[PDB]
Amino acid sequence: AKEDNIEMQGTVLETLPNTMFRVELENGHVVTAHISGKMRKNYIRILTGDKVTVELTPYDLSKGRIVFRSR
């Protein structure tokens, strides 16, 4: 409605500790992201350079998360 979270994704540049994504965004900046928890165990597998989603907030632009497969 007003301050909602946007899907606004990237290129995986690192696959981080367990299965996370140090992603270069569509805006040109590096963000830390995880996938959305749910699909991890129907394991929809990805590596260092895959087409990730990365949803983020209005306020905190340094982070993100693979919501639904959009790129």
From Swiss-Prot:
This protein's major location comes to cytoplasm
- Family affiliation: Belongs to the IF-1 family.
Q: Which SUPFAM superfamilies match?
A: Nucleic acid-binding proteins
Keyword Ribonucleoprotein recorded: no
One Pfam family this sequence matches: eIF-1a
Q: Any idea where this protein resides?
A: Cytoplasm
Any stretches that span the bilayer, and where are they?
A: none
Recorded protein name is: Translation initiation factor IF-1
Which GO molecular function, any one, fits this protein according to its record? rRNA binding
Give Gene Ontology CC terms.
Answer: cytosol
Q: List, for all copies, the residue spans of the domain called S1-like.
A: 1-71
Q: What does this protein do?
A: One of the essential components for the initiation of protein synthesis. Binds in the vicinity of the A-site. Stabilizes the binding of IF-2 and IF-3 on the 30S subunit to which N-formylmethionyl-tRNA(fMet) subsequently binds. Helps modulate mRNA selection, yielding the 30S pre-initiation complex (PIC). Upon addition of the 50S ribosomal subunit, IF-1, IF-2 and IF-3 are released leaving the mature 70S translation initiation complex.
Assembly notes: Component of the 30S ribosomal translation pre-initiation complex which assembles on the 30S ribosome in the order IF-2 and IF-3, IF-1 and N-formylmethionyl-tRNA(fMet); mRNA recruitment can occur at any time during PIC assembly.
Species per Swiss-Prot/TrEMBL record: Escherichia coli (strain K12)
Which keywords are on file for this protein?
Cytoplasm, Initiation factor, Protein biosynthesis, RNA-binding, rRNA-binding
